Amino acid sequence: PSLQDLYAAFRRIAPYTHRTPLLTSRLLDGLLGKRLLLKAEHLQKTGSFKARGALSKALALENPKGLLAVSSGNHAQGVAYAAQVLGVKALVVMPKKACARAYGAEVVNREEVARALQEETGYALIHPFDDPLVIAGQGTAGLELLAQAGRMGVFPGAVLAPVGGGGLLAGLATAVKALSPTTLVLGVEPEAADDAKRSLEAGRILRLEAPPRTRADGVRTLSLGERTFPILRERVDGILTVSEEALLEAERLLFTRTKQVVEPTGALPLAAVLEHGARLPQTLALLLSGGNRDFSP
Amino acid sequence: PSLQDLYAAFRRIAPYTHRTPLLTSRLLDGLLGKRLLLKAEHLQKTGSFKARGALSKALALENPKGLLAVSSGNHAQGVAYAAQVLGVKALVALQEETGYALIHPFDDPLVIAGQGTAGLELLAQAGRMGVFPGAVLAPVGGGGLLAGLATAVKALSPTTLVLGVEPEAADDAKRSLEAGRILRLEAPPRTRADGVRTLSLGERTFPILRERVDGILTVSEEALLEAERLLFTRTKQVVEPTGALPLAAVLEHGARLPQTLALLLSGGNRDFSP
Amino acid sequence: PSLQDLYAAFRRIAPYTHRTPLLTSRLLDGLLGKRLLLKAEHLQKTGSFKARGALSKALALENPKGLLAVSSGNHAQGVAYAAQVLGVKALVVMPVARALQEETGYALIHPFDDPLVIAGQGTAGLELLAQAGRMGVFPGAVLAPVGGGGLLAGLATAVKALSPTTLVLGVEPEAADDAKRSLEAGRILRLEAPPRTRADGVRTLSLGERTFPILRERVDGILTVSEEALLEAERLLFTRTKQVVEPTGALPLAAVLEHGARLPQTLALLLSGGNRDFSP
Amino acid sequence: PSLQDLYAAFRRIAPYTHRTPLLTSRLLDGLLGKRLLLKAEHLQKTGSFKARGALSKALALENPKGLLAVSSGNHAQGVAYAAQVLGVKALVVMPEDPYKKACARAYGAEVVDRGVTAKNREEVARALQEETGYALIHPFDDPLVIAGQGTAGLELLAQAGRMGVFPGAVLAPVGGGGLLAGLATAVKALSPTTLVLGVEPEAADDAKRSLEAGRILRLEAPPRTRADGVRTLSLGERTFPILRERVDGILTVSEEALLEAERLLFTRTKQVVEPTGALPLAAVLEHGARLPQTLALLLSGGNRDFSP
Ligand SMILES: *Cc1c(COP(=O)(O)O)cnc(C)c1O
Ligand SMILES: *Cc1c(COP(=O)(O)O)cnc(C)c1O
């Protein structure tokens, strides 16, 4: 999508989503020797940035009968919420479950199950990342980030976000490069599931043989999407990988220092600073993608 | 202390502490059928409101050799940060030895005055929003916070209810107010709210409570846990068990409390769980 | 009135008034060797702080039939605004009224000699301290214009209740220093006739009976200013901050121009109003 | 220029300019039947938006020897301010015919007044340039100046976005076209359906005439109007092509409407806005019926002299 697509997406979803804050922490800054800007999407409607993509697509549909969604978990809640906003029914096909079911969505291998439903109910299928309107929606988070950083008079040398299917990164990259092409846009992946990094270097989409094995449950995707890959090839500077150990440490830091509840895959950007800090610029914007983790006393 | 003491305290500590935000959540509101205002002290320096009290007292001393504290938990950290700010030593009989100044966690005027600054902020912030709470709820241990809070609130709007909250298995402050005298637990209570396992209210806080507090509510351990869960999952905020007591009270006594409530999230220093 | 009266007043009028900004001007701070905090009451409803006092009194009346007042100018608009909020009729007698009082039975809202009016004006003082605290700035003094004494009395009550060490000072044109003279004599001295000054808002013949004792106990002093300084201060606010402030609202700045050297470095100034005629 | 140029200009000038507020007034919205968003450039450093353009060009210069400018108003102050930031000297040429010279000199700029007049000023400056080697900063016919002015448009959309209000049209005054070209670029790049309209005194509608014509049309002599900041005899060479393709139209307003516009802002909002900075509000007064419901108005400046 283009920059205009992103702005139009912002206009459509603005009244139903939060202008999440760009948090800063002197504690973290001082411990890591960096100037960090934390885009708080864990404070977004439904607990993650996914509400943006789902609403962007749902509100552009002309008189749809209902909404249909694969799974993901976070995307399920996003679609359910959008279903509420439009006042229609939402059917979710999952393999985050209780929450989705809560928003008034009936939850229910994958692909074939959805296909048979899309024809059966006639609802609109909302893909979690391989849809132009969905990508435009996720990207609005990038438009905001720049505006907020601008208001602060702080310009990051790099923007770090997690990558699974690539919807968020593709959207973020489109926003950043259209305004400041010299700003690095970096994706982050668990080292145990680095098909995106390998795909980008080889110029072709490589797929993981089997489900990874990482605590970042939001990016256990087998491969990048067909629509997101070409955008990443053109606008993303690189992809960094992190160990499970560093991811755990990143979560611990957010939890204990900023008192924010961020789910594991939402902590990948911080993990990357922990392991590759010396090779990154001084001022970094981190996309805390979600805060939907289970409670434990 | 008086209202002028609290403001005097605010001035001393303002540069070293955060003007904590007053959070609102449409999820909690719609869920509890209330209008809740959450004073986020878990976002205060060191992770709890204790920083205010420690700083309030530390900055009031003339040439302090060092600072001394009787570890209770969050107070230890508060006193450490204070020493740091002053650029002196913090250690949590060593008094006569090194001559360090002892900072009690709740039974000291300047400490109580410091905790109270949270009450002054709450009111100004609510006032800017144009929202006036019918009641302010805060957890109670030794009574420093509740005493400071009551002082700020009653001095400005005596019709606003100031309610303390404590776990049912450690309801000494409630029964102490009932008997017009201090009662004391014989042994540490069995409760998840490790921040309020105090054996009794302080001697300097008790009188302020009988005079300025409207009552103490008790909560079950089950209600506490649920309050923690709602805060965790719905507001995505890390609040330690003791800081979720106010919300636990709304869960168990909602029907008999005002429609608009100010809750004091006293701290966020809870251990990380993978 | 009491600090609690100011807060109750704040609660009554909050919904119908503006929490006006506490403005800061790097330029001004630069031109003067000071750090100035400008309470923007010129941006309040009706154009002046008066809206505060009018609504405080008016919203506490039990089933008022209508409102009537000794029209001073800005007060007239405040009372008129208050009547619109209540939904009753406002009768203003601008250059008698008591007859209309008996006739209609309307409530008379005095411009300054009324506890509820004073309490109302005083809410600007509660805001000022709250906004300044949020900024982490603590002024060594607060300066405000003095006519009837309502504003200064309310302000003095708010500031002294929280920080008595903070200086509270009134300011009036030298051509009308009756309030100043009164604080010296310990009695209410009156002006032989209109003082004639550009600060039209404070050309009252004497301090009020309910405000005078509050001032004698809560006001640290009153400063007088020449008409030349007033004009200068008025030109400064106009060209440097681009704010339309009426002459009387510029008195506190004029005092800095003439007495700066003997005032603390950080000062809070109350810009009382911005209701001046337009002139291309 | 380009949207990236605008953002680049923003980055360069950000630390030395104000992110001026997007003011809203219940009163104004009441009088007119509109939702008005007022971009307060009168609150910008030096009193007008021109500080943006000036800094944008000046900060981009390498090892400048000094700054030079030929202006009869606000641009002079902008350049002088820019010169203070760089730490170099500023030379301003203005005809020997107000107090606006005092402000320029206030920012530490040297003013060449001697026997200077219109038509003659350009030659005097060219000569001063040749002699000093100082860089000349044009008030509107320079890509970096236009990019700088356009940053106001970037802020405007961000601020509007933050409050969730999307203007159906943006209105700004038109003199040389720098402000309008920069604003049109920012706005059209993000949302093309959003109307961008200029406003000029009807006694100087050369811009409106040029856009309808297809080429630049100049004025015989100095126009007669209160709006002193837009008495430019004609649009600029670099701004005109941008306007022709990125501007939806130009509105003209009576001197009567302008005066009322100024009165309303002065009395209702308590803001000191110079007459030309009031043109956008005047357009609403006279053409409100043909404009959308939600309008963004560019209050270009607040540099009018004090009047007791
Ligand atoms: C969906 C999701 C991601 C991954 O985004 P992709 O568009 O699939 O790259 C990352 N973090 C969280 C919390 C998510 O929900
Ligand atoms: C210390 C503490 C309390 C109780 O305060 P007292 O002044 O001792 O009543 C409550 N919550 C937390 C998180 C604390 O650290």
Ligand SMILES: *Cc1c(COP(=O)(O)O)cnc(C)c1O
């Ligand atoms: C009424 C008024 C004053 C004077 O206040 P008193 O309460 O009468 O002392 C000063 N400035 C303005 C703009 C006023 O309207």
Ligand SMILES: *Cc1c(COP(=O)(O)O)cnc(C)c1O
């Ligand atoms: C210079 C100026 C204008 C006109 O801008 P142009 O870029 O020359 O069209 C409008 N208003 C004010 C206050 C100005 O200074």
Ligand SMILES: [Ca+2]
């Ligand atoms: Ca992967």
Ligand SMILES: [Ca+2]
């Ligand atoms: Ca107890």
Ligand SMILES: [Ca+2]
């Ligand atoms: Ca007098």
Ligand SMILES: [Ca+2]
């Ligand atoms: Ca023209």
